[PDB]
Structures are given as C-alpha cells and as structure tokens.
Design a protein around this nucleic acid. Structure first.
Ligand SMILES: [Mg+2]
Ligand SMILES: [Mg+2]
Ligand SMILES: [Mg+2]
Ligand SMILES: [Mg+2]
Ligand SMILES: [Mg+2]
Lengths: 175, 109, 138, 190, 201
RNA sequence: CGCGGAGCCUCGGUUGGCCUCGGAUAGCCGGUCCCCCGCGGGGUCCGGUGCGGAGUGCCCUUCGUCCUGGGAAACGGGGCGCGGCCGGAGAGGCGGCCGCCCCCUCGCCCGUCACGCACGCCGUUCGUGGGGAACCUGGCGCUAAACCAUUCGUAGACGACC
RNA sequence: CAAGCGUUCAUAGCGACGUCGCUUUUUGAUCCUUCGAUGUCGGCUCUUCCUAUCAUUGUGAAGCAGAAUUCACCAAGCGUUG
RNA sequence: CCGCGGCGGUGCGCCGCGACCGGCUCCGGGACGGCUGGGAAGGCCCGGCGGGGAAGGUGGCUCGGCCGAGUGUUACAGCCC
C-alpha cells in the first residue's frame, strides 16, 4: 500500500461455492484505500488473515465507495489501530478532528509516518468510529472543542517570497 | 522609438548534466516567472544581435557593423517561466548571459 | 498585541486558491491549520479552508458555532458585509489593482498626459511653498 | 502538541507604575526605576487592568517548551516589583577556623576588599555591578549586606565574592572557609 | 530586472542569499552586496565559529601560503560562499565573480542609492523565531577581523547623516501633500482620470 | 583647456529612480495644545493609515517634427551661457547653493495646417562627443629621470643591495 | 549487566560468570597491486601529525586533614633526557 | 524584339507570406451515462418525536460605560446544534 488521499472502498466477498456448501456467507469490510484495485486487494490480505479464504477460492461481490454521510460537519474520529514497529507490533487509540472518516485516517497514515516512521504497508486499521464530545482522551483534539474558541495567526510569514524576488520594502509579519 | 525587441537573456542551451544539446537554447525572458505566464512568448521571433569587426549589409540601410542570429521561441521550459528557443544557426556560447531580443511581430492576439 | 480574534465568525477574505478574492465567514475551527468556512453571499460552499490561504478582517458577525447556512445567510445579510466592504480601504485598493491590469493602451496614454500636467501643477505650488517658507525664515 | 493558549496575570500593587514599551517592561515605584527586555521570549504582554491593576502575559500558539516561559517572564516581573518597592538584601556571613577574613568596602559599594582568607597574601578584590550597594554590617560580627534593586545584579555580586573566596587543592569538606550567602531577604519587609 | 543591483546584507541568511546572488551573477546582472557584517547565519553563535575554526585548521601542510585562504572580513567570507556556487574554474565563472562586488559597511556610491532585499533569503522569513544565531560580523571578529570597531563608528556616522536626508525628504512629502490640498480644483479633473483606471486611490 | 577635421579596432547596452532605522507576538505617518534639549532632536497627548496608496504590486519623464491662432497654463527653460560661496572624504567624485550677459515662451485641451505617402519586411530607437589605438587647428605651461659604465661597501655566487 | 572485595558499603577505589564494541603501534589469514626486480633488517639526523595524557595550565574524584595519591574532563599548549 | 502568353527545369545572395497534410505538444467550449438510480447542500415551509452544547437566561465573580464586556453552572428553548 501507498497513499494519495484515502477513500472508503467498502467491500463484500464470499468464498465461492463448492458442491458441499452452496450458500457460503458474505462479509463487508471497511477497506480503506486510494482506489478500487487495491481496496479489492486489501480485503483479501485482510480476510485471508481472519478466514481460510483466498483470491482463487473467492469472489468480490460488491466493491464500492462509502462516501460521507456528514461532510460539512466537524467530527471526533477515533481509531482502534494496529501497526508494526521495527521491534514488535503495537495497538493504538488515536484521535483526528477532521470532518470525514476517510480524511480523518488520511491524517493518521500521515502521522504514523511522522510520529513513528511507520509506513502504510505496516499499518492496520482495526476500526474507525466517530466519537461524541466527551469520551475524547487526546488533549490535542480536546481543545478545538469549545464555543468561544479564539486565535490569532501570530507570526504569519510571507509566502510569495519570490514575487518580488527582491524588493526595497522589507516584509511584514504582524497582521 | 523604444523596446519592441522585448528583453531576454540567453541562459544555457538545453542540457542534461553530463550532456548538452546546442540546437535549443534556453531563454530567460524578463518579467515572466511562471509557465502559465509564458504562452505569449510562444512563436515569437528573437534575435541575438551583435557587432563584429567587418561591415555587413542592412535591409533598409547602408552596410553596418551589426549581425544577428535570427530565431524563434518554440515552447516553455519548466515551472519558472523560462522558455526554449531554437535559432537558425546555433548560438555561439559567447552569448551565455548576454541579451537576446525577443520581438512581438508574429503576434497572435 | 493582536486585534483579529479568529472566532466563530471572523469574516475572512480569501487571499488565494480556488476562491481567491472572496469574503468568507469562518463558521468553526477544525484544527491547527484548517477551518470550516462558508461565504453564503459571496458564493462559497460550506467547506474546509486553511488559515494560510486566508487573511482576516475587523468585521465580526454572530451566527453560533455550527449554524447551518440559512442562519449565516442572515447575520451576513443584515450587518451587511457586501456594502460595508466596499466602503473599506481594502475594497478600494483592491478594485484599483483590478483597474490597472484592466487598462487599455488608450487609457494609459491618457494617464501619461493627465499625470504630467497634474505633476506640474503640483510642482509649481511646492516651489511656491518653499519661496514662502524661505520668506518666513527671513 | 501545541497548546492553543497559556497565560498568567501578575497582580501589580498601587505603589508601582509599570509601563511596557511594546515588549520591554519598565517599572517605577518608590525606590527607583527598573527596565528589562523580553525581546527573545516572544509573548504578548498586555496591561489589561485599567486604573493599573494587571500585567497579563499571553503565549498563544505555543508548544511545551515556550509554555514554560510564560511563567518565567511573569516571575522576572514580580521580582522587579519586589525590587522597586522593597528592594533586596542578601546577607553573607564569613566563615572560618583560623585566619580572619578581613573585609573592607572601598568606594561606596563597588570594591569589596579581602585580606587574609586562609593566610593568603593576595588581597582579592571584587567589583559589584552598577546599582549594587555593598556595606559591612553591624549588629553582627562577620557579615556583609548587599543592597540593590535588581535580583540579577545583587546575586551575581554575592556569588562573585562567594566564588572569589574558594579554596584549592584541599578537602573542601574540611576547609569550610570563605564568604557565603546566609539570608536572601529585603530591605523593607511590610 | 535590468541595471546594477544593490542588496543590503543585513537580516539575510549567509548562503540562502548567496545562492540567489550567484544565480543572477551568471545571468549577466551586476550585483553589489553591501553591509556584509549584518549578514546572519542559522545555527547558534559558537556552532558556526567552531565550524569556521575547523576551516582555519584546514591548511596545506608542506607549504600554507599556497593553501586555502581563510579570509576574515565578512565581505570576503560571503564572496567565498558565492564563489563555491559558481563554476569558477571556468571563464564564465570568473567572468561571473567580476559581476559581483561585496563591501563591509556601506560605501560611497552605495550609501547614495536605494537598495533592495531578498525576502527568500531574509532571516525573519526563512527561520523560526525560537532559533539561535550568529552575525557574520561577530563571527568575523572572533576569527581575526581587525575592523569591527571601525566599520561600527563609520556606519554610526553614516546613519546620523542618512537620517538628515530621510528627515529633509520627509519634509518635502509634507509639502507635496499640503500643496495637493492647496491646489485641488485645477487638478480635480486630472486626479479624477487617475483614480478611474486605478492609479492613486 | 578648450573647442576643431579623417580612422584601425573592442565591445556590452537600447528612460531613469537622488538614499533613514529597523520591528517582526509589531510597525508607518501626522499634529502638538503641553513639556525638556541642541531651524532642528527627545518626550507626552490626541488623529489617521497599517494583506501597507507620501504601496519597489512602487514614483517620475516622456516617444514621429514644426505652421498658426484659441482656450487652459505663464516667467519657466536655455546659451558645454558665464563668476563667487558652500556641503560632501571609507575607496568624495559629486552634488549643492548665490550675481550678470544674451537668447528663447516650451506641460494639457483644442481648432489648423504641414514634414520624401519609398510605393505589408532585417540588425529600427539611445547610454555615445562610448573604451581604446593611430593623425589635421589655437592658449597656456612645461622643462627628466631611470638603467649601464664608474665607485663604495652597510652587502655577495652570480645576480640582487648601501 | 552485574556475583564479590573494599572493617561496614556494589559501583571512593575495585570487580567475577556473562556480554556489546572499537583499534589498527602485535601476530595470523588472504593473495588484490608489483617478479623489463618499488633497495630487504637495525642505528644516526630531521620534519610533521595523532592521541592511545608520562609531565605542566585550568578543572571535577577519592576510603582527600595536612602531606602525599590514585579515578575522571577540557586539553595536545610546550616537555619526554645522559 | 515585345509579349514575362502557355510548359518545363531555378531561387545569384539575404528574406518574408500563405493554405492543405503527418506527427506532436497545448488551449477554449459544449452534451451525456452511471453510481447506496449518487452522496452531500440550498429554498419553502409545515406538522410533529426525541437528545447535546449551551440563553434573547439565570447565577456566583471580575472589568468597563441599567447597559456593555469577562469567567461559572442547570439545563427548558425565546440560538444553535
Ligand atoms: Mg548597434
Ligand atoms: Mg592534598
Ligand atoms: Mg561485603
Ligand atoms: Mg629503480
Ligand atoms: Mg582524551
């Protein structure tokens, strides 16, 4: 796996029917990836760990986007996680405060990169779930979280440092 | 009585790093720092202009001391508003970091 | 000391990006670089928008912190931004840049002339003020 | 993790009048006037209390290590206020077995002159900083009094003579001689 | 742009500037960097001193008068850094360096010219405010300048002078503005045509 | 020094911009009624600007020629026009400011006519009295030193040096 | 890491059974270069560099009272002889 | 010879133009299909049913000229969700 900006390529797939068992079960995984072709591939990595199921012996029935029910409304995304460190393999609760499940983990994958040097091909999402106000543990998130919430954008650099690559005026950064 | 010939520098000829390819020159036009910017400069005539020592003929004139390799802008060259231009004869390297004179007169407005 | 307190409801002019040069009410703050942003009457959907691409104004308005379009439709509409903006010094030096780029070679020939004689009628008075400033010194 | 806000109010008394030039705080009370620049630390110093009741230091888009400093500025300001109201007094009591450490101040404060520490012929001299008035005490035997408005200045100067007076090539477990600070206090107590 | 450039070194970043200088030197543009004492460097004071002293030990053992020349003045130091970003073995590289010109303090002609500033090499922009630094002035001193004191006292003398001009120039603008108001009905249908296509609003 | 006539060559260019200090979780400017200092400087108060409009996103000045016969504008400009007093030294090289002669009347609107209209074509326009190397006019000044040879040694291989 | 010694006490000073490294001033392996042969051991003289600090400067240790002594840091500034 | 009429070759030397075509590299438009017969949103309202932050609120405290501003709590809706 790599990345781009992730999307919920949700998927169900049966283990194709033998003469002995004619109506084997079906199973939606929230496979959670950059396009179809991998999000197909990613249930079967994932199902092949859980069930005794395989790309020969199966079929994807339905693969398709699940696409956000509330994408104009900010939300407190938690994520029972699992990864593989250079040492062992480790579980995590983590919170991202984006407004869209996918974009919320899009974060996570970019932080596991940064806060741990964990690459996507090592990570496993157990399950994302949006959380209410309370029942958030991470003070990073637990502050954006109020009503009379208040900023200045203190030491705002200029970008456009090459439009006028030179100038007479020195810049400004108080605004 | 002024520019017309609009101001530009000749930067290098199109090159890799352990190669260089002397057909196509790289032209640094003044006041154009984006690849969006540069679609005007496409197609335009340009001229590396000199004097050199012996006299030479001049259309609408008497024999002058001035000569020119006489060319044309093909296309843009990377994000920053550089341009690639191939003149009729190849440019003489002496000109590196000198003027060339990109005109307007094959305008397309 | 600052004076522009990224609230729920700082009007922000979008410096740049897909919606450049439009005003936008910051509905609510998502994160440490991203807001939930909406410009009802300036034609900008409720969407996420970063603090780096937006600069912010002395103006506030008073929807509350996840109000739903209809309610930021109002509070903008009365309070009246799109008239109060346009009496600002922003709006008049924007809509000046605008008018220089938007200027035919004719217009520019006129100005060349109009300036020149302005700059003489201004100069002769400055010369005359130094005469009076020198006679005052005497 | 960056913390959206941290702040602290210093409660300024009725005696004193602080007036901050941007970031640079100046403080004038009864005793004198002090100044100090926080042109490093980078915070927002407001003087919110009208009449004149509060210095408030903000900090604002700050991670852990600058959040520290909110409180440190807040301190060097209290520490100024105490200095320009009350004024500080570090006492330092000379200590020995044998050779009497023999102190003698020599312009006003300024030169603190020390014969005989441990029988040494070299007469240690020590300058004070500006605004630090040293003086030999009374009502006690071997005891200096360093008076000044500025903590910073008064306690280098303690330490300068406390450190000028150090033994070498011995057991400083045993050789417990020299001059050292016994009591950090104030001139006026209230 | 055209013509001679003058860059005011203060508040810039030693190499970040020099890369920008050196690009334009190679495009035939004449640059004149001024006031190189003021030029400043990322990393803390000592770090870069220690890094300079490392330079000074680098030295051609079998004869040193051949070996590297560790010039001490900031002008010279910067030159070096620009030069390392030119192909200075070759003719265009030496022809380039000649288009450069670099001073400590700010001299005749160049006192008397307005002068520019590369924001993309400018320290306030490029650096974070919670980071440490050297001024190439103080660095240059502790490495073997003789002339931090002099270029101080001269620049103080120049600053005092320049301030006079700034104030007299300030006084002409006050006359311009008062004379606009003292003649605003025989330029009141020219100023119109200015503000209509943007100019002067 | 001025101002004159030809000609090898070596090139780059093709309006200028004549100025604070610096801050950056801050600045810019005004005005002071008031206060202190040396027309200025410092202070305090208020009033404006501050994604900056006495903004390098900037300002200025013009760019086919002259006619003449209205208005707007009217003492502006010139004669390498001419003397005196400044100020400027970091490696000045430039300003600045005062008499007198002669000459001219120009920026913006307009009438009104004109300029080889070369019959769709290229190095067009200037910084150009460039830089440098050779030669034709007047006035005023000028008016050698160096090296060899010799001598000396304070120095020595010879060279070098006193 | 740490079982011990050190009157007592792990670790002032030491430190077993184990275990992780450097280093190329020891010898081995190896046989990459040279057999149209690069002078093959020591001594003298003379430079310069390193630190893997024996002295000295400034320091922190000690089971340092002094005296004397070892442990360690910056440190290679000048020393190392007949 | 004057035609430079019609045909066949070229250009002395420097050049410019045009319209087909091949290959490219770009740039403007405009119309549709599908999809959890797309999610989301808007407007208009209406009639309902619930929950949280939190009030045109109340209240403890502060700061300013009953009003304006700050914090603290129960939570109905006279805001919003
Ligand atoms: Mg020419
Ligand atoms: Mg001892
Ligand atoms: Mg024991
Ligand atoms: Mg041999
Ligand atoms: Mg060592």
């Amino acid at each position: 796996k790599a990345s781009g900006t992730l999307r919920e390529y949700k998927v169900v797939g049966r283990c194709l029917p033998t003469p002995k068992c004619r109506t084997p079960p079906l199973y939606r995984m929230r496979i959670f990836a950059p396009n179809h072709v991998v999000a197909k591939s990613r249930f079967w990595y994932f199902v092949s760990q859980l069930k005794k199921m395989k790309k020969s012996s199966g079929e994807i029935v339905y693969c398709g986007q699940v696409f956000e029910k509330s994408p104009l409304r900010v939300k407190n995304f938690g994520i029972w996680l699992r990864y593989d460190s250079r040492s062992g393999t480790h579980n995590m609760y983590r919170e991202y405060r984006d407004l869209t499940t996918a974009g919320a983990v899009t974060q996570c994958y970019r932080d596991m990169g940064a806060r741990h040097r964990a690459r996507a091909h090592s990570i496993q999402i157990m399950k994302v779930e949006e959380i209410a106000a309370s029942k958030c543990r991470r003070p990073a998130v637990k502050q954006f979280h109020d009503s009379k919430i208040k900023f200045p954008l203190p030491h705002r650099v200029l970008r456009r440092q090459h439009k006028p690559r030179f100038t007479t005026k020195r810049p400004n950064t108080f605004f | 009585s002024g520019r017309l010939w609009s101001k530009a520098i000749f930067a290098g000829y199109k090159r890799g790093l352990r190669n260089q390819r002397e057909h196509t020159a790289l032209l640094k036009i003044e006041g154009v720092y984006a690849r969006d910017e540069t679609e005007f400069y496409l197609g335009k005539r340009c001229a590396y202009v000199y004097k050199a020592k012996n006299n030479t003929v001049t259309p609408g004139g008497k024999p002058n001391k001035t000569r020119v390799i006489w060319g044309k802008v093909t296309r843009a060259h990377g994000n920053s508003g550089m341009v690639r231009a191939k003149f009729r004869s190849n440019l003489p390297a002496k000109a590196i970091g000198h003027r060339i004179r990109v005109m307007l007169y094959p305008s397309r407005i | 000391v600052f004076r522009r307190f990224v609230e729920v409801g700082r009007v922000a002019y979008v410096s740049f990006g897909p919606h450049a040069g439009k005003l936008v009410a910051i509905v609510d703050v998502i994160d440490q670089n991203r807001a939930l942003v909406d410009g009802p009457c300036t034609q900008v959907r409720r969407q996420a928008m970063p603090f780096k691409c937006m600069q912010l104004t002395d103006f506030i308005l008073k929807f509350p912190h996840s109000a739903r379009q209809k309610y930021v439709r109002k509070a903008w509409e009365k309070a009246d931004i799109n008239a109060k903006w346009a009496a600002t010094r922003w709006a008049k030096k924007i809509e000046a840049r605008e008018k220089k780029a938007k200027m035919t070679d004719f217009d520019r020939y006129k100005v060349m002339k109009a300036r020149k004689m302005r700059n003489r009628l201004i100069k002769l008075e400055v010369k005359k003020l130094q005469k009076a400033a020198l006679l005052k010194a005497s | 993790m960056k913390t959206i806000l941290s702040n602290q109010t210093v409660d300024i008394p009725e005696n004193v009048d602080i007036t901050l030039k941007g970031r640079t705080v100046i403080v004038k009370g009864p005793r004198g006037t002090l100044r100090r620049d926080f042109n490093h630390i980078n915070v927002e110093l407001s003087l919110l209390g009208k009449k004149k009741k509060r210095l408030r230091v903000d900090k604002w888009w700050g991670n852990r290590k600058e959040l520290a400093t909110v409180r440190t500025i807040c301190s060097h300001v209290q520490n100024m206020i105490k200095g320009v109201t009350l004024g500080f007094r570090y006492k330092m009591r000379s200590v020995y077995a044998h050779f009497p450490i023999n102190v003698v101040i020599q312009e006003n404060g300024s030169l603190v002159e020390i014969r005989n520490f441990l029988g040494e012929k070299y007469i240690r001299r020590v300058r004070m900083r500006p605004g630090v008035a040293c003086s030999v005490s009374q009502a006690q035997k071997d005891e200096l009094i360093l008076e000044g408005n500025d903590i910073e200045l008064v306690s280098n100067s303690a330490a300068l003579i406390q450190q000028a007076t150090t033994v070498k090539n011995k057991d400083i477990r045993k050789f417990l001689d020299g001059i050292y600070v016994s009591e950090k206090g104030t001139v006026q107590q209230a | 742009e055209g013509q001679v450039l003058v860059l005011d070194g203060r508040g810039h970043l030693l190499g970040r500037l020099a890369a920008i200088v050196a690009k334009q030197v190679l495009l035939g543009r004449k640059v004149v960097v001024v006031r190189c004492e003021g030029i400043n460097i990322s990393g803390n004071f000592y770090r870069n001193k220690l890094k300079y002293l490392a330079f000074l030990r680098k030295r051609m053992n079998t004869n040193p008068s051949r070996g590297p020349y560790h010039f001490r003045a900031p002008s010279r130091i910067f030159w070096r850094t620009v030069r390392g970003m030119l192909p200075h073995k070759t003719k265009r590289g030496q022809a380039a360096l000649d288009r450069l010109k670099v001073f400590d303090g700010i001299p005749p002609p160049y006192d008397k010219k307005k002068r520019m500033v590369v924001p993309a090499a400018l320290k306030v922009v490029r650096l974070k405010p919670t980071r440490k630094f050297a001024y190439l002035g103080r660095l240059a001193h502790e490495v073997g300048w003789k002339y931090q004191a002099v270029t101080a006292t001269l620049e103080e003398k120049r600053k005092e002078k320049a301030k006079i001009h700034y104030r007299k120039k300030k006084q002409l603008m006050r006359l311009r503005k008062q004379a606009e108001k003292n003649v605003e009905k025989k330029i009141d249908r020219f100023t119109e045509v200015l503000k209509t296509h943007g100019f002067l609003v």
